Amino acid sequence: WXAXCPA
Amino acid sequence: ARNTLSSRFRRVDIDEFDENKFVDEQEEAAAAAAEPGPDPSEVDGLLRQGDMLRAFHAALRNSPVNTKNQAVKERAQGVVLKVLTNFKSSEIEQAVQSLDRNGVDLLMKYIYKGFEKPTENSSAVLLQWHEKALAVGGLGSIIRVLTARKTV
Amino acid sequence: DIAALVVDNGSGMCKAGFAGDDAPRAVFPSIVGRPRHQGVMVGMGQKDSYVGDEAQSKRGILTLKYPIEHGIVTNWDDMEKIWHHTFYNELRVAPEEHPVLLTEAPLNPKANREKMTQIMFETFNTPAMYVAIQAVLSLYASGRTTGIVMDSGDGVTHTVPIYEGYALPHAILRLDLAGRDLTDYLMKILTERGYSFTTTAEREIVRDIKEKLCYVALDFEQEMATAASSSSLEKSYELPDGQVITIGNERFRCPEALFQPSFLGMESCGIHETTFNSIMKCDVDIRKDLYANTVLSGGTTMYPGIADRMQKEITALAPSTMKIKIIAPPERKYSVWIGGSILASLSTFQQMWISKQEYDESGPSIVHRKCF
Amino acid sequence: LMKILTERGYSFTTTAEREIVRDIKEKLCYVALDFEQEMATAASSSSLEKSYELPDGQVITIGNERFRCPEALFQPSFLGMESCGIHETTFNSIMKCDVDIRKDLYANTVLSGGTTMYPGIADRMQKEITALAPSTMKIKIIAPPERKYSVWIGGSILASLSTFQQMWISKQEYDESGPSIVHRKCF
Amino acid sequence: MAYHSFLVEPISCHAWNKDRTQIAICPNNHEVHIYEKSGAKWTKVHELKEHNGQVTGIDWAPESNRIVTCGTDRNAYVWTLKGRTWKPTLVILRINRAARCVRWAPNENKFAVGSGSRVISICYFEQENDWWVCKHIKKPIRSTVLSLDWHPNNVLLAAGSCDFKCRIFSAYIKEVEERPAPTPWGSKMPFGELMFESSSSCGWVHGVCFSASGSRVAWVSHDSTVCLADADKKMAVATLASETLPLLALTFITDNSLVAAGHDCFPVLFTYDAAAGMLSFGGRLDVPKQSSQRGLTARERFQNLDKKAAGLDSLHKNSVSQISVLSGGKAKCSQFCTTGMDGGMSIWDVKSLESALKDLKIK
Amino acid sequence: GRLPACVVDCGTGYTKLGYAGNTEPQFIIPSCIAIKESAKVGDQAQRRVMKGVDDLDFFIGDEAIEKPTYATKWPIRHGIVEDWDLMERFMEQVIFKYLRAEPEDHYFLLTEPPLNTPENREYTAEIMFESFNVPGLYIAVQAVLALAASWTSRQVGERTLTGTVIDSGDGVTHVIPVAEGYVIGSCIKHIPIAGRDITYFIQQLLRDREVGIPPEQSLETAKAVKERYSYVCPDLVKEFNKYDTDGSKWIKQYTGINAISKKEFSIDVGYERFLGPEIFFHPEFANPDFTQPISEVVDEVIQNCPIDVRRPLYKNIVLSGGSTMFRDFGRRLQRDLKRTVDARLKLSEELSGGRLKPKPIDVQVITHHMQRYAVWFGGSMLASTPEFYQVCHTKKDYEEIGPSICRHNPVFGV
Amino acid sequence: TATLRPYLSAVRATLQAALCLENFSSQVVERHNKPEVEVRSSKELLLQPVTISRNEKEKVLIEGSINSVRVSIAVKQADEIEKILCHKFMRFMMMRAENFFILRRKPVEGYDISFLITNFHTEQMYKHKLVDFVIHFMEEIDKEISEMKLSVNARARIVAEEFLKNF
Amino acid sequence: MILLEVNNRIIEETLALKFENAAAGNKPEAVEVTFADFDGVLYHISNPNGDKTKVMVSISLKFYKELQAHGADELLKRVYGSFLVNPESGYNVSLLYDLENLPASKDSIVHQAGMLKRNCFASVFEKYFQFQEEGKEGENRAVIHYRDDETMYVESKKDRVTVVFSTVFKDDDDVVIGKVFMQEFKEGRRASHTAPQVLFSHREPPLELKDTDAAVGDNIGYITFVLFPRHTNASARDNTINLIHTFRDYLHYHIKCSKAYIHTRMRAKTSDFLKVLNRARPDAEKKEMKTITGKTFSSR
Ligand SMILES: Nc1ncnc2c1ncn2[C@@H]1O[C@H](COP(=O)(O)OP(=O)(O)O)[C@@H](O)[C@H]1O
Ligand SMILES: Nc1ncnc2c1ncn2[C@@H]1O[C@H](COP(=O)(O)OP(=O)(O)O)[C@@H](O)[C@H]1O
Ligand SMILES: [Mg+2]
Ligand SMILES: [Mg+2]
């Protein structure tokens, strides 16, 4: 992901 | 340096006006009495009826393989292409195996003349036709296509 | 004949094939490998990067990277290479001759599918494409029109209830907890025995171990006591160098994380509670139909005895008058693709593609209007 | 060998006789498959002694020494060194590589140099590595009978390749960069 | 029976002497190389260097032991063996383009040179001046003359051309021989007459050959077709269209059977049925040989792993370009020699070939 | 409005950058490129593929010699570009970093030696027209622009359009006779012996005799010895004798700095004071293929031009390029040429019968204020006129005909 | 690939129906030996030019003769980026047209690439290997151009990241 | 070089040379140097009326009118002090250095003289930075014609500064590669946790350009930067101005280096195809060993 978690 | 004299005498190509050049003969009977080739009406009648093998054979019944007229040749080519590109992909082997050696040597010409002006799916079926006709006739058919002097 | 391509393109394993078949034509790990040394031998295979099975074979001298992470594409320069290897090397078919059917997990960034469409149209020039949700394809493969799918994909878990073909987009649940997290957890807990796996080439070995020896426990505490009291539950595996390892208690602690994310330091709830909550999110008058049509999917639900554990947990959660029936076909590993080979082959679907000219008119944002 | 030949009674001490000792080594010495068994054998019967003629008519007879010279390769504690033998060195070198390639290395061990031309060194190396490698790895010691010239033979193969013309250090390239170019053009 | 590769470059043409102990070949350059059979191996004995361009036709007169060579320098030479060296006598062809083929007459009194100047040159001797002179047959020809073969009566001459036609001219020279006897081709035979002209209009004619009795003329086309015109049947044409690549050479091993070769690299056999007037594919003469593979060394493995990151099942690895009859004449042949564009020279045998294949019957 | 055309004279040992209309090049950098090179195996076209954006990690000019961890490559050898990847990168930093020109608003005037193969011109056109997209290009011969650089230092009323230009640069020495403004191309001479051959000869001399020169600077020293203590001798053996009998005066000392430990080394400059430039009047000293002095080559050049333009060509022999900045070079050249000419004239008079004594042919060698960059200024003239925009190859011409538009130059006919 | 299989089979079967070449000296000039399909001097040594097309815009034109064959290939070009890349790639192929002995420094007008196989190339080099080279080019050119396109995309992304990182 | 630089090299070189010649005490020589820069800017360093003691550096820009507006010379004046004089006829801005009144530390004035174009741009741009800092909504929004067919629409609000580049490339190849280089420009915000919101559009112009004369059309691309008060504060606005100033030129530069990049891969693939052809040449049976030059070996 972009915010929260990686991906 | 550069040339300040007239060199325009080099542009004239006299070789196209030669008198010992090769001219392709044609028979006097084949030049006087032209063969109209296949009858398109019979072909459309046999196609509407729904018989594919007999329409195929009627497309290869007689061909302008002796005339010099472009219109009859183009029309016969159009009719035989209309027959070839409308078969089911399954009945091609059966139609090919129902031809003599000359039938295959002419079908290969009608194939190689259908690649030059293709449509959305004409070539995708002419390639299968070529596959079967080459399986039957071999490279000799392609060579009799290349070394022909009158195109159909 | 000319038929649409179906490319699953999961998070851990890319599966591609032709529509109208009952098995994917090509299946290979979606990894990209690049060498980390310098060749010294003249003329011996000096090429930029290996992809797919070739990378798995030569994994000793490469560093492997996964393009898709948690169901999200995080490296497009590698996803493009993956799709290129799928088209020109695995299927060996031109991309601009067949429509394509891609898959995506639900509740995903819109930029993901927008870039998917942009890549499929600008780069590969496919005449049509479509991006369907994975759980819907799994249900299509199951052969019914009502039920709750629980696609525990390798990269991502998600549940999507469907009733009479009417998906309920307010009861869909997604949990970023799947095969790769279990692989990392196994790598973390294998150190207790003394086996140390750090590099990616070793993570592949750990995945091969997980995919072979691990199993889910019907009752965790009972199995723990049994493994502690008796050395009758240990298994032996031979690494690809001759070494032999023996794993016991660890076997059922790796997949147990699915039912207890607290092991992985997550606040989330197990997949059983996820499915139960996704069911209770629906209106009451259909819940029974879901209780009796729970469907599993994904390569992470292939663990032995997972149907029993799921049924027991849900029966303990749900009321005592509803019939719980965990539908777990023995072919689930490919269901997501199988349904694809069905959906792309239907005759009432050929008007739902995203034609090339539609994209050329309306930009890549048309995927939100066409694809559900 | 010059050191251990004294205990028999022969003394080679000048740099011209070191050549004689080298000839004795490369004509008589060999590697014992089982060191202790061969020691107990040659120390209990005169069936391993060989006689060599010096370039002045003298004949010497060496027994136990024959396999004691090359044995130093497999346990340098004889020379007062701490490093491991050549077999353990090769095994360590293999074990330093990643786990996915070791099986391919075990079956492709290659010997070279004229010091690996001792009779029965391939069998010794195989028997020693097999004791250090897991019981499922197949150990192949690819020792061709042209091992002494191998380093040169590979060179002629390399310098005859087409792409090798793009790996030269051209005289022009040196005239402008001095000797520091070899570290850039040759690893 | 054997195969010998003289060089890696093509062989333009070859010729044998009377006792088939010496061969004259073209190494694909200006020189003519005469090799001699010494036991089992060949050894080059003579080099004839007078031409400016590469030779394209060599012919060896058996009875007189005189070689004739025509090349792309528009010249012809007659080599005679003086003592130990071959000395050339220049012939004035008066052509303005490259010559293509040369053939001695059966009686060795004249020879025919077909050239690319759309003429045929019938050269003979003038002992009044020691002068090699030539007359021209140029009327119905419209292209290069590719192949020649003489009638056994020393007059008629079969010529194939690039104008798709095979013709039978009359090369009667009224100053070296008597008026010839009437043949089934025609009774009027003045110099330059046209006795027969095929009806084909497709494909060039690479090779023509008269029968052993001079009553049949066969030829091969680039159209893959092999044809035979019979003179005892009102000059009737029997054609056979093959399904392989074209042919380049042919010969008459019997009065009924032909041995052709070409861009396939293996000899094939055809048969003629006079009771029906139709050719029949007798079949491939060579038995497909299995070429042994060789293990690669390390120097060659890396040499072809760096540089480049047999397919053919016959003796020749390139197309066969010339077939001659070694021993037995054309009435009952027993050995025929083939030379192709791979520098090889295959001495075949009819008995061994008929023995190896029992599905092979020679009419 | 129009912006001034960019002039880029790319020579083997030095490149002169500027905007047309000025008096001197805005930049004079070394024609070298520093790129990251390591120990790799494989072809050159294969190890040049850089992943990511690593192909822009390079420097050119003065900033490429300072870099001690980069490898310095010279793309141009003997005036002929032997490497086109490095040349394209060099051109792109020349345009986008030094000139700061937007290559779509400026006509470009590049240069070339006489015997540049046509494929080099086609590749240059492909680069400037398809990669940089210049609206027009013009590839002029190098020495013909050097003639219009001697007019700024000669008195009014004697600035002629006729003369023999001798351009001796780092990699090539060519002789071009211009008459009335028309390049007599079929008489141009071209010799690949130039400054860098002198620098190799001098370093080989120093390395056979001297000690203490750091290897990594053995070239950098042979340039400071060549462009400082070098002169021309009227006689060779007499100079060897003058150095042998009175070495205490003719032998100089050169003191340089070892740029690793900053210590100082000292060497003795002896015979290489006069043996360096002598490869101009004895080209066999550096390349055993050529054996003809430069005076004889100039005499052949002038004696091949039309007859009635031979006498003015002898009067305006203009030197150009750096390698002609050797003390008393023009003097020895003019002395040899005057010897040849006077001998020929006396022979013609003797053969005539001895009735007429013709006018002695005036021979003059013109050294001027602009020699080091005489080419570029010439370009800065040609690319500042209106007629310039009528002789360039417009972008339309390339888009229509292709790179073969740039295939012809005034050295060969048709 | 497997979508070009019948098209490539037809092209290969037409290639070894031509390429049956022979030595031939010119007729319209004294001693020159020139490829008869390039000069087009004599109309009797020229076979029919056969076209093999997979669709409207991908084709092979084969022009035979007695001592030469000219094979022109019109490659697939889907959009403008593929057109630019195909042009540049064919151009970088022409640049080395003496290492490719059967290549042609300029393509026939209307076609993307052109090979010219005379008789010396079939006498001094393997014929079936030349056929294999042509068919391998036709197999792999689309794949290589697609990889070029992906490389351009990656370069664009890296440039964007290198700019937007400094803010 | 990845990022384009903002300082001109010719100005710095010429002025440093003149200042070294003046500081050493040599008599001043004439100077007349005209040149150009990116975006059609024209520089001219000369002497006023043959006065060899004064050097005047003049610059002609494309945003001619936006710099003449009131308040568009605050930065220029602030940075250049007494060097700023009346423009030379035909040019737009002009500095005048007296070679006899040069202050000490001649490096600073030359470092600020090489950035004349950057300072003329930042002077007409900090107006909106201030309009946003002072907490006023609806301040003046304009269109800087920084080129001749492309525009930069600047707008300042209470909480942001919107910059919309309307850009179009001249060559067809450049247009085709620029479509890609601009489509892939939103994938840059994954390289930093703090990057201005970037929006790309070529279907239709944004709603900011519906009351203004910024260049619009069906061949133009629109790139919108939304600079927030963390990119336009009084400490990080220099970098922001540099980047917004050199954005278009940087994109053009990298579009033109993409081709020299692709050429290497094309050469590699050409060699790879040559290696497939090489399987047709029959390996020789014996080769004659030659020398580095190519002459006969002359020995075994
Ligand atoms: N029989 C099995 N038991 C346990 N885990 C498995 C089994 N088979 C596969 N897996 C794991 O599950 C994942 C396979 O899921 P898959 O169907 O490939 O979905 P995706 O396409 O998202 O990878 C892999 O990460 C693999 O390690
Ligand atoms: N004053 C000088 N004396 C002798 N040689 C010089 C002098 N100046 C330059 N050179 C030599 O000339 C070459 C550079 O001159 P230049 O005209 O720039 O050549 P190019 O233009 O081909 O680079 C260098 O090799 C340098 O050593
Ligand atoms: Mg999946
Ligand atoms: Mg120069």
mmCIF file of C-alpha atoms in Angstrom, chain F residues 180-255:
data_model
loop_
_atom_site.group_PDB
_atom_site.id
_atom_site.type_symbol
_atom_site.label_atom_id
_atom_site.label_comp_id
_atom_site.label_asym_id
_atom_site.label_seq_id
_atom_site.Cartn_x
_atom_site.Cartn_y
_atom_site.Cartn_z
ATOM 1 C CA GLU F 180 38.957 32.380 -55.207
ATOM 2 C CA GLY F 181 36.661 30.864 -52.572
ATOM 3 C CA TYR F 182 36.227 27.478 -54.283
ATOM 4 C CA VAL F 183 37.652 24.443 -52.498
ATOM 5 C CA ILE F 184 39.886 22.548 -54.933
ATOM 6 C CA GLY F 185 38.848 19.225 -53.476
ATOM 7 C CA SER F 186 40.549 16.814 -55.864
ATOM 8 C CA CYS F 187 43.935 18.096 -54.623
ATOM 9 C CA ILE F 188 43.371 17.820 -50.857
ATOM 10 C CA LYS F 189 45.980 15.782 -48.986
ATOM 11 C CA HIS F 190 45.336 13.932 -45.723
ATOM 12 C CA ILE F 191 47.931 12.345 -43.415
ATOM 13 C CA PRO F 192 46.971 10.659 -40.117
ATOM 14 C CA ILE F 193 50.246 11.796 -38.504
ATOM 15 C CA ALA F 194 49.669 14.665 -36.086
ATOM 16 C CA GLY F 195 50.167 15.953 -32.506
ATOM 17 C CA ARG F 196 49.304 12.705 -30.744
ATOM 18 C CA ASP F 197 51.894 10.777 -32.758
ATOM 19 C CA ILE F 198 54.455 13.344 -31.594
ATOM 20 C CA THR F 199 53.267 12.785 -27.970
ATOM 21 C CA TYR F 200 53.618 8.978 -28.318
ATOM 22 C CA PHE F 201 57.079 9.353 -29.857
ATOM 23 C CA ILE F 202 58.171 11.733 -27.098
ATOM 24 C CA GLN F 203 56.914 9.481 -24.305
ATOM 25 C CA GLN F 204 58.634 6.475 -25.872
ATOM 26 C CA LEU F 205 61.842 8.517 -26.002
ATOM 27 C CA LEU F 206 61.487 9.608 -22.369
ATOM 28 C CA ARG F 207 60.645 6.087 -21.195
ATOM 29 C CA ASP F 208 63.713 4.560 -22.863
ATOM 30 C CA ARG F 209 66.033 7.064 -21.159
ATOM 31 C CA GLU F 210 64.570 8.826 -18.112
ATOM 32 C CA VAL F 211 63.581 7.409 -14.730
ATOM 33 C CA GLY F 212 61.232 8.773 -12.094
ATOM 34 C CA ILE F 213 58.223 9.536 -14.293
ATOM 35 C CA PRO F 214 55.066 8.032 -12.735
ATOM 36 C CA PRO F 215 53.463 5.582 -15.181
ATOM 37 C CA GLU F 216 49.938 7.005 -14.822
ATOM 38 C CA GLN F 217 51.322 10.357 -16.044
ATOM 39 C CA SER F 218 53.829 9.171 -18.661
ATOM 40 C CA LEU F 219 51.569 10.689 -21.322
ATOM 41 C CA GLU F 220 50.648 13.868 -19.434
ATOM 42 C CA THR F 221 54.368 14.580 -19.107
ATOM 43 C CA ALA F 222 55.160 13.969 -22.782
ATOM 44 C CA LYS F 223 52.627 16.709 -23.638
ATOM 45 C CA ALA F 224 54.191 19.261 -21.239
ATOM 46 C CA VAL F 225 57.619 18.382 -22.637
ATOM 47 C CA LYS F 226 56.339 18.633 -26.269
ATOM 48 C CA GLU F 227 54.349 21.890 -25.943
ATOM 49 C CA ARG F 228 57.104 23.758 -24.003
ATOM 50 C CA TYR F 229 60.682 22.763 -24.898
ATOM 51 C CA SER F 230 60.090 21.635 -28.524
ATOM 52 C CA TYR F 231 61.442 23.560 -31.527
ATOM 53 C CA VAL F 232 62.430 22.854 -35.121
ATOM 54 C CA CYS F 233 65.992 22.251 -36.252
ATOM 55 C CA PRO F 234 67.500 23.265 -39.605
ATOM 56 C CA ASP F 235 69.522 20.044 -39.605
ATOM 57 C CA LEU F 236 69.220 16.821 -37.636
ATOM 58 C CA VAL F 237 72.723 15.361 -37.342
ATOM 59 C CA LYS F 238 74.145 18.832 -36.706
ATOM 60 C CA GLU F 239 71.682 19.217 -33.833
ATOM 61 C CA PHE F 240 72.639 15.829 -32.402
ATOM 62 C CA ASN F 241 76.244 17.029 -32.482
ATOM 63 C CA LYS F 242 75.308 20.361 -30.886
ATOM 64 C CA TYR F 243 73.638 18.463 -28.046
ATOM 65 C CA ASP F 244 76.536 16.027 -27.674
ATOM 66 C CA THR F 245 79.400 18.536 -27.536
ATOM 67 C CA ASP F 246 77.688 21.258 -25.443
ATOM 68 C CA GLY F 247 75.039 19.366 -23.502
ATOM 69 C CA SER F 248 75.318 21.806 -20.596
ATOM 70 C CA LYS F 249 73.359 24.400 -22.625
ATOM 71 C CA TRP F 250 70.967 22.478 -24.889
ATOM 72 C CA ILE F 251 69.699 19.971 -22.296
ATOM 73 C CA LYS F 252 66.848 21.379 -20.220
ATOM 74 C CA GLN F 253 65.147 20.240 -17.011
ATOM 75 C CA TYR F 254 61.426 19.596 -16.534
ATOM 76 C CA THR F 255 59.987 19.512 -13.008
#
